[PDB]
Symmetry: C5
Subunit: 283 residues, 5 copies
């Protein structure tokens, strides 16, 4: 006897087509369903961010730092954080960062009209913001986790956050923009990874490595940064709204959109636009 082979891989035309169709479907939903999907996605992001911050603050201890700095903490933070996108995608959710590439690709192919593009993007952005800030208020702020203690021994869950936030509010426009470009490149790949492996083992680990690289690299995300900076504002961490909404979030937003539609959408449309035709004529 001899077993039978299974094709657990299919790339190229297949993946691009899957992504364009994904972007196409997002049209014939309704406003409420997209709203809810986006809010759930924001909730998941915020939850995994809470978890990763607590890990980091554990490893960001009074004395470890005098030797090791912020390495172990950022590492475990990155290690803990990617579970979120698995939740998001396998729940049926909508992420603004993940929708840039797919839906602008469906736009380029002249399937999703413009008003649809705009309302989908706006609703997803709004819902993600809602989810993240909500989870920042109810679950985190009321849990007394990241609150100041005035004890060098015990306050290592505060400094960490503070530090990270104090880091994201001193860069310049160009810096944040490029870092967000890198972020969205990664997460778009991560999305491409989950629309291509078509198996359980492949999804988890590809998305894991993508998001771990994103985190350990120090890049920026409009949905993660919202959570972090809002909650740091809830604790009276040494930042303000100016330093957060007016300085950082707009850079990250524009960088994500760029890396989504231009850096990675135009090339992919150009390369494959001629094989997406032979699939639409047949059917």
């Amino acid at each position: 006897l001899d077993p039978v082979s299974i094709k657990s891989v299919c790339g190229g035309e297949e993946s691009y087509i899957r992504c364009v169709e994904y972007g196409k479907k997002k049209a014939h939903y309704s406003n409420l369903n997209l709203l809810a999907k986006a809010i759930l996605a924001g909730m998941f992001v915020g939850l995994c961010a809470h978890a990763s911050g607590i890990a980091g603050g554990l490893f960001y201890y009074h004395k470890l730092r005098e030797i090791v700095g912020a390495s172990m903490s950022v590492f475990v933070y990155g290690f803990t954080f990617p579970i979120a996108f698995m939740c998001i995608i396998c729940t049926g959710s909508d992420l603004f960062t993940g929708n840039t590439l797919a839906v602008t690709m469906a736009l380029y192919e002249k399937k999703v009209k413009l008003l649809d593009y705009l309302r989908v993007m706006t609703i997803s952005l709004f819902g993600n913001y809602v989810g993240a800030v909500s989870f920042a208020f109810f679950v985190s702020y009321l849990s007394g986790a990241f609150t100041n203690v005035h004890a060098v021994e015990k306050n290592h869950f505060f400094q960490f956050l503070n530090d990270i936030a104090e880091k994201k509010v001193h860069h310049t426009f160009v810096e944040c923009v490029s870092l967000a470009v890198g972020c969205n490149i990664f997460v778009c790949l991560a999305v491409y990874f989950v629309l291509t492996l078509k198996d359980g083992a492949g999804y988890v680990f590809s998305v894991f490595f993508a998001v771990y690289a994103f985190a350990i690299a120090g890049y920026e995300h409009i949905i993660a940064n919202i959570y972090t900076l809002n909650i740091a504002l809830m604790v009276n961490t040494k930042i303000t709204v100016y330093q957060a909404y007016i300085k950082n979030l707009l850079p990250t937003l524009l960088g994500n959109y760029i890396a989504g539609a231009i850096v990675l959408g135009l090339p992919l449309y150009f390369i494959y636009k001629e094989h997406y035709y032979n699939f639409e004529r047949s059917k």
Copy 2:
């Protein structure tokens, strides 16, 4: 030749709805044993993980890394509980909320069966956890106070985790339980959708690991930890255990499983379960 293993959203929603539905033809007596066995599994993994963490809680290591490696290895070790629970047909409260409540919302179950399934499973988990705490953890002398400071790294850890679980306030434990049960319901959704074997392990692993290393409270693990921390004469009072820790984390886990994930999910997908029947 070619077909895709993973299936999210619609298929997974139908799956979870039917899984909640099937908890109501089991004649009131398989549920009890299934629950007690899941509780035994919980307490077993908790014993193992507490030993793991008391190892990295040594006298001198505390000074430098201060309770980091302990929590990390505890989280790394705890997950297998869920795999053994699911691969055995057992029943767990924190994971039954989501499914049975979705089934309820769809008018495939009544309030009677819903309430009694909830109650039976809760009681079975309590029974299993306390039984394992008595038979294995207390008589094994693994968590005995050896007053010497070199060898007492197994007791202190427990004393210094439960002591934390019992000096919260209400809202705090409620929120932390909401987080925990969101993670858990999500691990269950995974295990129902992936249906592969690879993610069947690693998705649940990562989810439970985040749960543990984040600081969230789980109703069953709490029962075990606190009961066995009572057996060994820690500095926790029996009032600080049942009226400060279990009530709020229970409420929070039910909140999370029932309204946070369930309601919006049933709202996004109500339409597409109305078509499968026909």
Copy 3:
């Protein structure tokens, strides 16, 4: 799909347990011996590892955490070999052949023959890999210098602990062990894929080990070799205090706490499945 769980698992298990009696006697003995020396192999490995990390100056900071961690990380490879080769190990089969007995698929004499022969073969394999490999290698010998002796102190520091545990302690720890191992066999026969096999057995065994639970077969190896290298123990302590309670506890767990309930849980399904055809 590549996983069913719950019902089909019980049936797979009782069938796997039922085929152990059509086997000839010697074949079963050979499988048991192979499994014993597999256990001894992986134990030698895990021990050299935990000894590497039981270093003179590393102890004074972390104590013994790194060593036991590496032990638990390395050991979870024997049972993969036992399963893939078609062997038969005692702790793993306690549950399997007791269920076949419950459903009236196996008699008493044959069930007990299976148990005796498998235990004997496991002992043979363990002691054989001990003598012919671990003791002639000169790997655990003493050197009388704290710089290199970290491979012997470890042993002197572990079998001096399995020994001093009292009766109920060893019984409960063996219970935990055999529960983990029963779940491991359940998984490895119900999760139908390589990733599933490997990563559902690995975590179970790592937890068993890191938890301080005692296994009948592993402790045989450890105590034999600890006797050969002239550690600070004795045959009395090695056989009476540690092995008999471990055996009793492993059997109690595999055969009562775990198989007696689920048997009642999933009885009608096996019954009608055998009435099917």
Copy 4:
């Protein structure tokens, strides 16, 4: 019950290799250039990420105990995802192409000019993408700046040390290190061509990449990224040391690894059965 064999042997990996290489030259001169640029982009991005990791693990005090141990390990843990992105995106890397297309040629499926067409388009696009990402992201971010203080300057100092060590080798050393690198790389390509699984695709490449990373091997495209960005951030190196001392030897070695060490023996083993295959 069903029987499954998601793996395949060497008789068909070689054929897939041949076919992949054969296909590679049938594309336009435009989409090939774009694929190359995209692969270089991926490479530069993951190199940025891995270098920031390694520098994070390069603190003042952690150096005085473990030197440069953990940094290389985390670097090599982070580096591998580049080839996943590349292969699943449909893009081509120059090193991978060196073995894939040389074989297409030996079998006489391709001709002598499309080989060079493809090689040069790929190398040009890889250089373009690497240098572009080095500029738009790694120099516009102040990540690898010389802040001039031993607390944070580690992020730069690491690069300095790595770069300096990379450019002080003799001609015969870099060619051999490059040989090893490209061997591992073409072998990971072989893997992802034959195994046909997500677990495979991910981890078979993870291990190989971690290996040629932490072994101190030299890769042709990686080096374009880290040497060009080094020039930007004003390390203690020089363009002569960066181009005539590393890239020429590295390229020669990568090529004589992809196309001789592994290419000729394989073409001797499995050529007969390719004749069996065609008909």
Copy 5:
């Protein structure tokens, strides 16, 4: 939804093995030689990588606190990639193919002449590949050079230690350690042969070879590469202590493990089941 299971363990994993060990003997002399040489190249490559890792971790100040733990740990984490190379590219390795060729002989599918021929070709190719990589790559690359400076020499000293531990053994010690090594690697071959799924191959062989390496057992090919590179970079050993004190015992023990300790019970257990395979084949 349809069920799929990949691993058909036990009985099947024997049959395949036999056929495997048989194909090696229908091949030609050029093919098998090239295959062995490629496997040797792979072994030498991965061993160089692993030594560099371990010495990077064997830093002057790290040793005074940890000894040699992290070194061997990362060595064992890095080495288990040669095996996948050899498996997927179709090479004839010695310690591995010994069990299969035995099984093919015991089952009277192969002759004694052919057995000796295949074994000699395999071992010769391994020696060639490993020495070629130890000279053309590892020795010219100055990786393991002596600098006579402790802040930097930690890639040399590591080697100078490993070898200086492999050549203060006695005969029975090395024989048993080789027995163990081969009981591990033959087992790894069994895993990939019977798993038939992606993660199976990689992670099974990874754990097996990691345990092997961390165990301290000796494998005939790796020791060739290591002792030869050490002789190149002028450690404190010589050739007598290389082939007379380590390689003969190691090959002996490995062959014993392959064809006697393991396998022979696998013939006795299953000899019939092979006979169960032809008559119903047609």
